[PDB]
Amino acid sequence: ILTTAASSMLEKFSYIPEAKASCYGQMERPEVPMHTLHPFMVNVTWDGKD
Amino acid sequence: LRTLWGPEQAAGLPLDVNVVALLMNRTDPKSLITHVCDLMSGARIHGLV
Amino acid sequence: KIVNIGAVLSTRKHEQMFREAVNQANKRHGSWKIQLNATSVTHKPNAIQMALSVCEDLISSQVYAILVSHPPTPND
């Protein structure tokens, strides 16, 4: 499921918003400019099972 | 071995997917802080199961 | 017996107001062996963290209840 979401990323982007670094700092903001998997987790099919 | 079989199964991944797994028994937030923050320090892990 | 009660503020003068109200609570209608020690924490600069003092400092000191303000800006 995650790899079809990542393939839909590689369709609609060619880059990935990386995970955060530390739990102990907030550097700039939480601006999700590269648009994480919530439209990309919409369509997932595997092996005859949606 | 399950990850290796999933990798050799299908949809052969231009992304080099790498998985870090552990076994615990805790409902404990310091365990959450240690495990989660140390894995976020390590290479910014992107998937969660 | 010893009941630790937390407080989340931005200041510490009102944390001392909590401490003096704990003194009042030991005086008023509630008595007497030893049942209270003082715990009071300001707001943290990293809003990710927010539980370091709680587990390391409050739950480790067995805090039953925490009295929480909005934020250090209180409007974000």
Does an H or E element contain C7, and which? strand C3-8
Question: To the nearest whole angstrom, how far is the Cα of A4 from the nearest Cα of chain B?
Answer: 9
CA–CA gap between residue B48 and residue C35 (Å, rounded): 44
Pick B47's closest partner by Cβ from A2, A21, A24: A2
Residue B31's alpha-carbon distances to A8, A13, B23, B27, in angstroms, are 33, 35, 12, 8
* Beta-carbon separation of A25 and C47 below 8 A: no
Which technique was used to obtain these atomic coordinates? cryo-EM
C34: left (phi over 0), alpha (psi -120 to 50) or beta: beta
Phi, psi values for residue C11, rounded to 5°:
-105, 175
Q: Which amino acid is at C69?
A: S
